[PDB]
Design a protein around this ligand. Structure first.
Ligand SMILES: CCCCCCCCCCCCCCCCCC(=O)OC[C@H](COP(=O)([O-])OCC(O)COP(=O)([O-])OC[C@@H](COC(=O)CCCCCCCCCCCCCCCCC)OC(=O)CCCCCCCCCCCCCCCCC)OC(=O)CCCCCCCCCCCCCCCCC
Ligand SMILES: CCCCCCCCCCCCCCCCCC(=O)OC[C@H](COP(=O)([O-])OCC(O)COP(=O)([O-])OC[C@@H](COC(=O)CCCCCCCCCCCCCCCCC)OC(=O)CCCCCCCCCCCCCCCCC)OC(=O)CCCCCCCCCCCCCCCCC
Ligand SMILES: CCCCCCCCCCCCCCCCCC(=O)OC[C@H](COP(=O)(O)OCCN)OC(=O)CCCCCCCCCCCCCCCCC
Ligand SMILES: CCCCCCCCCCCCCCCCCC(=O)OC[C@H](COP(=O)(O)OCCN)OC(=O)CCCCCCCCCCCCCCCCC
Ligand SMILES: CCCCCCCCCCCCCCCCCC(=O)OC[C@H](COP(=O)(O)OCCN)OC(=O)CCCCCCCCCCCCCCCCC
Ligand SMILES: CCCCCCCCCCCCCCCCCC(=O)OC[C@H](COP(=O)(O)OCCN)OC(=O)CCCCCCCCCCCCCCCCC
Ligand SMILES: CCCCCCCCCCCC(=O)OC[C@H](COP(=O)(O)OCC[N+](C)(C)C)OC(=O)CCCCCCCCCCC
Lengths: 192, 80, 506, 161, 117, 105, 78, 60, 183, 70
């Protein structure tokens, strides 16, 4: 197995789309035009009516383009998800991920973001959405919440790696970062 | 009395009477789920009971439509 | 992708006007949807990553490399089946218009594919019951898609009643387990595998055995497959078995942890009876679909022996057997749909009545296929020889791999009985071949202008007009050569089945 | 005296002697009513009311189908039975009503101890909805999917067009 | 049957007063306090009057809808039931299911999700 | 890890703690086999059905019969009708045998 | 072309008018239902311009102080 | 080599009630929708949870 | 919540008949090794009326008793008997002080709660008098934690929800203090 | 009448949400909408198919009178 660095065991929907490579957009376009193109190919392989070629009606090409558009995004979404999971090469995504987290930590802001959900719902949302991309071909389900169950330890952002000295981020301790679990239960142990 | 299949005499001699037996048999499963969930003070069993009731009602409708169309097929001349 | 594209197709089908062409083009959109579903699923699911077993959706589902292979097989076979409704099977409108007259045909298939793929993944008793209903309901709706057909509706009534009784048995088994343990998640229930009543899981298997047509519950499936249209019988006789047998394998994988030999004996009793009925049942029959129904019952008994043994050799046997049997099933029904074009026409004793749903209904309607189309007749012979288990066809290695797993586990009786069952069932497999070819010389110089194919016109009398459409011909050619020439790549294919793991690891 | 035993005794008698399809649609209602009442008085009043809300709507639809399919067959037909064989059958059945054979579980009474820790005190339906709409939301969304399939399924079966 | 049908008319009239007109709540809080201040709360006569007052508010609202049952009978002609099915399934159901989505959205937007108290 | 054994008020019920300690034992990496978690499994099942505890009560009742002990002299006093949970039975200073009100709280 | 059926992607405004005149039971039921999610999308505006969200209810049991037990507490002894 | 390779792959190690694979990664009950602190019968400390049994990936 | 359970009185005697319920007593006292403590004798309405003064007086002992329960790790009811006795005595001390210092003001408030379905919103006027009397004589202030001091519901000037029926005694006692204290 | 049963179950499925609207918060509200949006496709389907009409057995069609002149 050619495993790589784990970035996010449950990447948020916005992060997955933002981290699209130019090829991911290219495949999104290929899916969008691959569905009308296959309708032309199937007619070319064997005409639907009779024995002569007939272009499929525009209404069929309209619904085909929509089906391909969703299919192209689902393919691109799974292509970008593998980089977060470490299944696919993600050297570029690690550098971008480290810059964004260190930038947010230096601002004493949560790398995950503030959530409308209470501690139970953040945990419940992560349980529902983590690894859901494995069935994205069957039915959709996305991480659209700011939970903290991402399968990573934020202490690994406190070691400077090669090519990160020019960032000059001064990182505070984790108990001063707003909206994190380790800085939330101050007065009561069952209330954030 | 159960092992000699006494329940086969209690089921009526129409296709709809078989439908009623199926509903009663499934309703026995839900009553057993409610009984266990209440004793344990477990809401997961009651969620299961609610799912069984909704699903059992779905197949009741699907089976009825098949029987409805089956009767239409017999009354097909419809010269009127 | 499946769920999202199904909603668009549901709405789009109800918007545009009703015409045969539009329904056929909507079916081709369903073909593209399954292809994209396969591409997306392949892009994200890989055998090496799923070997451990990954939980999804609050542990309601659990996908591993054993589940994943079956999901891809289901998608691939569903692709081949949709080509039947998305392209011309015969090219003559009196026969082919049936596949385009129901706009909800493709919608029901997409509904059932979702149920087929999710069922092997179930990791909770609540979701096990929900999904097994989702798969069953779609099968009933597909069995009744032709609601103007008396036999099609009668089959759906029989299917609904029997399949509801099995579902209640399945529900009753899960309720008993929940009553014992108060738990719903399968992995949680595995922690108490030594304390719950293991026969509560045999009741769960009994409901699953009804849904695959195992003896003694074989009667309804033999009746339903013969009464349903050939296009419907092709789907419903194969698709439920791909998912339910995979689920039975996973359940039997958990059952073997406690090693209850009493449970192993009851299942062996059902396998033994099904071999006897599957082989002797088909000896005196005149319908081809009734014959294939017993063939299905027999091949399920072979797979259940591998499922019952449930070892490392059983994963390879079941995985290879289910793949090669699905292709043989697809190939045979493709030929049966095509060869209706060679049927003689009247211009009479026994008052034989043939309908548009099943133009090929009797075994002796395959007469003189060796004369009408030698290449197709050979393709049908290769498939039938594969079911017989003639080496080096795919069907031989299927029986060979099943025997290895069965004999490795001490199932001496069932291994001997199946080999006797194979010999008995060879009698009615050979009868197909006898009908195809044995009267070739005593009929070679005869004038047959009374065929269904002769009703078709001719374009210019200077062109070459192929007698069979392009897509259906290429599929039959591809599958037949795969069945014939599997010896070339058998070593590489079986090495792949070595990697498919179900919590083996080390 | 547990009068539910008598109710089920009468219901079992009428299920053996039922002849036509109207009597069967009455055996169903004569079964849900003992279930609803016993759930109301012993285990769950919430599910006693859910049964009434859902099954009654199913019963009337079931009844209206009987009107469209009643086919004269069993009004004039004859049954034999015998009063002695009916009552003897019901007597033998009544002898064994122990669905479980754990004598201690069936004879020894138990209690629970209340605690005051649950100060946020709400109904069972609020907790059921809390879990169903958060943790088992997939189960709810599949059920919604199955209900959609039934809508399409009923139309493609019944509608001639 | 006649008794039960008119019992249902009273029930649905009283439910219209409960679901939309506050049930037994007084029309005027000022007048309700004025009338009840004449009677000592340490005497049983206060609770008789309060029981008459509160039920009177419910009676007045329910009387108006029992009047409305009679009022619509004397003004409108009968509608065929096959038209009633189309009216309920094509008009009333889409509107009611719109409000079942409308109402929670409004309350969430203004942080006013209801609780029992 | 999905929630199991949820009480009627949304929190853990009586037997959740037994179930939680079983999961922690079975999933701990310090255990070579599942033998250490066998007593925890019996405790969880005892929390739900109390089958062994009911069995102990069966022995005590039976053993008291064979020695002639009176059930009403060694057991615990009880009342079967809720209306007769009277102040005299409850032991109040000015108690009475008149029925208590249970019609409307 | 006085009363033709508008094409939605060519004449979106006229397409809306056709359904609002001929199928009011469809046009206005959707219009009411659209106001649900639209208000849910206006929630961030309220959190910045009218008033903030309330403090969550103490519905997670008794609030246990996040500290160690006071070992010098006395009073009301046996 | 071919005989040796098949002997390794086709060997099925024994499973009993003492050793088998359970796919549960974390202990449940850290959070409940309401009333997380019930009868204080939850004795599992999520602050000092011991390492879990990580599943084995044979291809890693 | 009216769910039938096995830990308290159920809805009706038909529930008891189906369950064959036995209402069981135990004549044995607590073992003599455990120190004795007098139980709290107040009923529902007085306890709810005194809830926020028991909280403001026994906060250290209430938290210490609950923190003992968490540290008990299942052995709760046994290991926190000593802490529980402190809680009972402290709560009885508050009720004792109410009956000697604020007796009329206290009895006024929980007689309104009995008159008004035990809803705090229905008895603000009597509560205000009791809060004023307790603060002067016991130095206890009702505080609802987690919110600003000026957003406490019991201090709201113009509440949206008000009692339909007015407690006559509370109206009279509120007027008397208005004309005599806030001149 | 048959389609009444699927819609009746859908209405009965909202009962858990009615008494738990506050607790589930925005997460439950979005799930509630998703429950209703999937069922609204059934409503679109029934409208477009005209499945909720009355199944008459007679149909009144206006024949055109034409003359095959010579
Ligand atoms: C957007 C407009 C649109 O859907 O297309 C117009 C489409 C065609 O209307 P038309 O005037 O009859 O067109 C004449 C031809 O039959 C129409 O022939 P056609 O082939 O041109 O239209 C078929 C259409 C296929 O249309 C669909 O598949 C509908 C997708 C919804 C699911 O194929 C497309 O054009 C695809 C692009 C348009 C749909 C894009 C939907 C994106 C997903 C959201 O109208 C609809 O389909 C309306 C369905 C939705 C009704 C509203 C549902 C409300 C749900 C939320 C309520 C709460 C708020
Ligand atoms: C067989 C049946 C099977 C079932 C099929 C049914 C399918 C169900 C699956 C659908 C999803 C399942 C989950 C449903 C439960 C959702 C409940 C929930 O999450 O509430 C919490 C969530 C709030 O909790 P939170 O922790 O504070 O998270 C805040 C943001 O949502 C998160 O932070 P953010 O970074 O995303 O910031 C938000 C802002 C970010 O905008 C910015 O300020 C720029 C930042 C970069 C964004 C640029 C890339 C944007 C991509 C274009 O704008 C957004 O990105 C909107 C998020 C939604 C994106 C589109 C959703 C994809 C649906 C397909 O409520 C939401 O607003 C979720 C988003 C809207 C709901 C999506 C509904 C989809 C249908
Ligand atoms: C946005 C949804 C609406 C966009 C529709 C625009 C469109 O489809 O192009 C119009 C074109 C119709 O052209 P045509 O019908 O041949 O000429 C009129 C004949 N009387 O239609 C066509 O010829 C088909 C050309 C491709 C249409 C692509 C539309 C994709 C729909 C959006 C998918 C993403 C969401
Ligand atoms: C369209 C055919 C595409 C074949 C794709 C087969 C496939 O699913 O991949 C092989 C699969 C292992 O895939 P995996 O390693 O998990 O993921 C990454 C692999 N790229 O291994 C598998 O599990 C596949 C299991 C099913 C194999 C079925 C074999 C089908 C034989 C060809 C079909 C006949 C083609 C007829 C042509 C008609 C079209 C004109
Ligand atoms: C308000 C009270 C309403 C009921 C009062 C009438 C009492 C009659 C029995 C009520 C239900 C008891 C169990 C019966 C189940 C249905 C079996 C049946 O067929 O109905 C019995 C009725 C008697 O007909 P009979 O002449 O005795 O037998 C046929 C002889 N060839 O044959 C009939 O077809 C007549 C049935 C009339 C319609 C009854 C509809 C069912 C109502 C049930 C509501 C109560 C639920 C059940 C409670 C009792 C449970 C045993
Ligand atoms: C899709 C749009 C979602 C983005 C949006 O418009 O609202 C998001 C917004 C979250 O942002 P914010 O106000 O900063 O939350 C504070 C966190 N402590 O506030 C919200 O989360 C409001 C909820 C958004 C739901 C919009 C309607 C969902 C659409 C259903 C179809
Ligand atoms: C923004 C707000 C307004 C949007 C209006 C859009 C109308 C689209 C339309 O009507 O789409 C047009 C189509 C097809 O039209 P047709 O009547 O079949 O034939 C067209 C006219 N001819 C005969 C001249 C060709 O209708 C539909 O698919 C109707 C689906 C509506 C389902 C609504 C169900 C109720 C849900 C309410 C919320 C709970």
């Amino acid at each position: 197995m050619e495993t790589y660095e784990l970035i996010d065991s449950d990447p948020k929907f916005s992060r997955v789309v933002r981290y699209f490579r130019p090829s991911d957009y290219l495949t999104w376009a290929l899916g969008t035009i691959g569905a009308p193109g296959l309708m032309v190919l199937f007619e070319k392989i064997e005409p639907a009516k009779g024995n002569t070629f007939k272009m499929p009606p525009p209404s069929i090409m309209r619904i085909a383009t929509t089906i391909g558009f969703f299919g192209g995004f689902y393919y691109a979404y799974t292509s970008s998800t593998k980089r977060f999971w470490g299944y696919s090469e993600n050297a570029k995504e690690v550098a971008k991920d480290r810059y964004e987290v260190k930038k947010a930590l230096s601002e004493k802001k949560s790398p995950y973001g503030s959530s409308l959900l209470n501690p139970y719902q953040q945990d419940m949302s992560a349980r529902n959405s983590t690894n859901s991309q494995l069935l994205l071909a069957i039915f959709p389900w996305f991480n659209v919440a700011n939970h903290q169950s991402h399968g990573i330890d934020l202490r690994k952002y406190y070691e400077v790696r090669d090519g990160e000295e020019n960032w000059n981020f001064t990182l505070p301790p984790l108990d001063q970062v707003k909206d994190l679990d380790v800085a939330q239960y101050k007065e009561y142990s069952n209330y954030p | 009395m159960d092992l000699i299949l006494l329940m086969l005499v209690a089921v009526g001699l129409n296709i709809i009477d078989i439908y009623i037996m199926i509903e009663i048999l499934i309703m026995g499963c839900t009553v057993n789920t409610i009984y266990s969930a209440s004793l344990d003070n477990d809401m997961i069993g009651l969620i299961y009971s609610l799912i069984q009731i909704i699903i059992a009602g779905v197949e009741s409708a699907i089976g009825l439509s098949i029987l409805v169309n089956y009767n239409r097929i017999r009354n097909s001349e419809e010269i009127e | 992708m499946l769920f999202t594209s199904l909603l668009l197709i549901i709405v789009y089908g109800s918007l545009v006007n009703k015409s045969h062409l539009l329904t056929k083009l909507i079916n081709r959109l369903g073909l593209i949807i399954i292809i994209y579903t396969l591409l997306i699923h392949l892009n994200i699911n890989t055998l090496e990553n799923l070997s451990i077993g990954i939980n999804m959706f609050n542990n309601l589902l659990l996908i591993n490399s054993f589940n994943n292979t079956i999901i891809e097989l289901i998608l691939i076979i569903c692709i081949l089946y949709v080509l039947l409704i998305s392209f011309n099977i015969t090219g003559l409108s009196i026969i082919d218009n049936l596949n385009y007259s129901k706009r909800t045909f493709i919608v029901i298939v997409l509904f059932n594919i979702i149920g087929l793929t999710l069922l092997p993944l179930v990791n909770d008793i609540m979701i096990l019951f929900i999904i097994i209903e989702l798969q069953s309901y779609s099968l009933y709706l597909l069995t009744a898609i032709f609601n103007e057909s008396h036999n099609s509706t009668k089959s759906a009534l029989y299917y609904f009643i029997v399949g509801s009784i099995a579902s209640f048995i399945i529900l009753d088994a899960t309720v008993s387990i929940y009553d014992d343990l108060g738990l719903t998640n399968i992995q949680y229930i595995l922690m108490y595998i030594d304390k719950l009543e293991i026969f509560d899981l045999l009741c769960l298997l009994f409901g699953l055995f009804i849904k695959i047509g195992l003896a003694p519950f074989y009667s309804y499936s033999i009746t339903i497959y013969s009464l349903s249209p050939t296009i419907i019988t092709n789907y419903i006789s194969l698709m439920p078995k791909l998912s339910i047998l995979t689920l039975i394998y996973i359940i039997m994988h958990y059952i073997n942890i406690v090693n209850n030999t009493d449970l192993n004996y009851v299942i062996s009793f059902l396998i033994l009876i099904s071999m006897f009925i599957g082989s002797f049942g088909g000896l005196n029959v005149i319908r081809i679909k009734t014959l294939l129904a017993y063939s299905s019952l027999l091949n399920v008994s072979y797979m259940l022996l591998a499922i019952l043994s449930n070892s490392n050799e059983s994963i390879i046997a079941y995985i290879y057997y289910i793949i090669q049997y699905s292709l043989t099933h697809i190939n045979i029904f493709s030929i049966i749909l095509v060869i209706s074009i060679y049927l003689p026409i009247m211009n009479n004793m026994l008052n034989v009545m043939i309908t548009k749903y099943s133009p090929i209904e009797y075994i002796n309607q395959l007469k003189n296929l060796f004369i009408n189309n030698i290449f197709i007749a050979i393709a049908l012979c290769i498939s039938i020889f594969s079911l017989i288990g003639i080496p080096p066809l795919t069907g031989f290695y299927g029986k060979y791999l099943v025997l290895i797993s069965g004999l490795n586990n001490g199932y001496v009786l069932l291994s001997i009985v199946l080999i006797i069952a194979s010999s008995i069932s060879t009698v009615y497999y050979a009868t197909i071949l006898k009908v195809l070819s044995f009267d070739t010389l005593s009929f070679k110089d005869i004038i047959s202008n009374n065929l269904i194919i002769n009703t078709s016109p001719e374009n210019n009398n200077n062109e070459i007009k192929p007698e069979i459409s392009n897509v259906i011909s290429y599929v039959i050619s591809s599958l037949t050569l795969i069945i014939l020439l599997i010896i070339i790549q058998y070593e590489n294919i079986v090495k792949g089945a070595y990697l498919v793991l179900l919590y083996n690891w080390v | 005296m547990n009068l539910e035993i008598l109710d089920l005794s009468i219901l079992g008698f009428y299920s053996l002697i039922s002849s036509n399809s109207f009597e069967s649609i009455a055996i169903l209602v004569a079964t849900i009513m003992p279930v609803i009442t016993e759930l109301w008085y012993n285990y769950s009043q919430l599910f006693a009311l859910l049964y009434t809300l859902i099954y009654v709507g199913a019963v009337v639809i079931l009844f209206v189908f009987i009107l469209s399919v009643i086919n004269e067959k069993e009004e004039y037909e004859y049954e034999y039975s015998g009063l002695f064989i009916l009552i003897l059958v019901l007597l033998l059945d009544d002898l064994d009503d122990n669905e479980s054979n754990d004598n201690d579980y069936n004879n020894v009474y138990i209690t629970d101890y209340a605690d005051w820790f649950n100060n946020y005190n709400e109904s069972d339906l609020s907790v059921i909805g809390n879990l169903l709409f958060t943790e088992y939301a997939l189960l709810l969304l599949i059920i919604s999917f199955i209900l959609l399939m039934s809508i399409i399924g009923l139309i493609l079966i019944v509608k001639k067009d | 049957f006649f008794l039960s049908e008119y019992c249902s008319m009273v029930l649905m009239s009283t439910l219209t007063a409960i679901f939309f007109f506050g049930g037994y709540l007084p029309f005027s809080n000022t007048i309700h306090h004025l009338i009840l201040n004449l009677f000592d709360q340490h005497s049983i006569y206060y609770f008789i009057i309060e029981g008459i007052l509160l039920s009177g508010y419910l009676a007045i609202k329910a009387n108006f809808f029992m009047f409305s049952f009679v009022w619509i009978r004397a003004a409108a002609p009968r509608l065929r039931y096959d038209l009633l099915i189309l009216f309920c399934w094509y008009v009333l159901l889409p509107i009611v299911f719109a409000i079942v989505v409308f109402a929670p959205g409004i309350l969430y937007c203004f942080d006013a999700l209801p609780v029992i108290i | 890890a999905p929630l199991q054994q949820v009480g009627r008020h949304g929190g853990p019920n009586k037997c959740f703690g037994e179930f939680q300690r079983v999961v922690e034992c079975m999933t701990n990496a310090k255990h070579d086999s599942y033998e250490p978690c066998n007593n925890l499994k019996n405790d969880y099942l005892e929390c739900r059905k109390h089958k062994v505890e009911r069995y102990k009560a069966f022995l005590m009742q039976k053993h008291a019969e064979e020695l002639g002990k009176d059930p009403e002299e060694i057991g615990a006093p009880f009342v079967r009708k809720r209306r007769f949970l009277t102040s005299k039975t409850l032991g109040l200073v000015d108690g009475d045998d008149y029925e208590i009100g249970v019609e409307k709280i | 072309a006085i009363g033709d059926y508008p094409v939605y992607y060519k004449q979106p405004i006229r397409w809306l008018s056709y359904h609002a005149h001929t199928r009011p039971h469809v046009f206005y039921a959707i219009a009411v239902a659209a106001l649900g999610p639209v208000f849910m999308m206006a929630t961030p505006l309220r959190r910045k311009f009218l008033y903030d969200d309330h403090e969550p209810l103490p519905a997670n049991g008794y609030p246990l102080p996040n500290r160690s037990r006071d070992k010098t507490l006395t009073g009301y002894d046996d | 080599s071919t005989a040796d390779l098949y002997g390794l792959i086709s060997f099925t190690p024994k499973r009993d009630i003492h050793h088998y694979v359970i796919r549960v990664d974390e202990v449940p009950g850290k959070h409940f929708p309401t009333n997380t602190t019930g009868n204080f019968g939850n004795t599992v400390d999520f602050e000092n949870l011991e390492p879990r049994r990580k599943p084995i990936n044979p291809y890693l | 919540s009216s769910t039938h359970t096995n830990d308290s009185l159920n809805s009706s005697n038909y529930v008891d008949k189906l369950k064959d319920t036995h209402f069981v007593f135990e004549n044995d006292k607590l073992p003599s090794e455990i120190p004795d403590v007098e139980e709290v004798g107040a009923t529902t309405a007085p306890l709810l009326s005194a809830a926020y003064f028991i909280g403001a007086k026994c906060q250290d002992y209430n938290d210490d008793f609950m923190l003992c329960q968490k540290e008990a790790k299942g052995n709760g009811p046994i290991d926190c008997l000593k802490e529980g006795r402190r809680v009972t005595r402290c709560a009885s001390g508050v009720l004792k002080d109410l009956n000697t210092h604020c007796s009329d003001e206290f009895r006024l408030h929980w007689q309104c709660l009995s008159f008004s379905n035990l809803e705090y919103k229905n008895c603000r006027k009597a509560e205000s008098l009791l809060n004023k009397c307790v603060f002067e004589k016991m130095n206890l202030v009702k505080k609802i934690p987690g919110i600003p001091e000026d957003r406490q519901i019991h201090l709201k000037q113009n509440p949206v929800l008000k009692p339909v029926a007015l407690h006559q005694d509370s109206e009279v006692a509120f007027k008397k203090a208005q004309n005599e204290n806030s001149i | 009448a048959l389609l009444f049963l699927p819609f009746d179950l859908e209405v009965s499925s909202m009962l858990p949400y009615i008494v738990s609207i506050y607790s589930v918060g925005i997460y439950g509200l979005i799930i509630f909408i998703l429950f209703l949006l999937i069922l609204i496709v059934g409503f679109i389907y029934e409208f477009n198919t005209k499945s909720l009409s009355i199944t008459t057995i007679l149909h009144k069609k206006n024949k055109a009178l034409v003359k095959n002149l010579y």
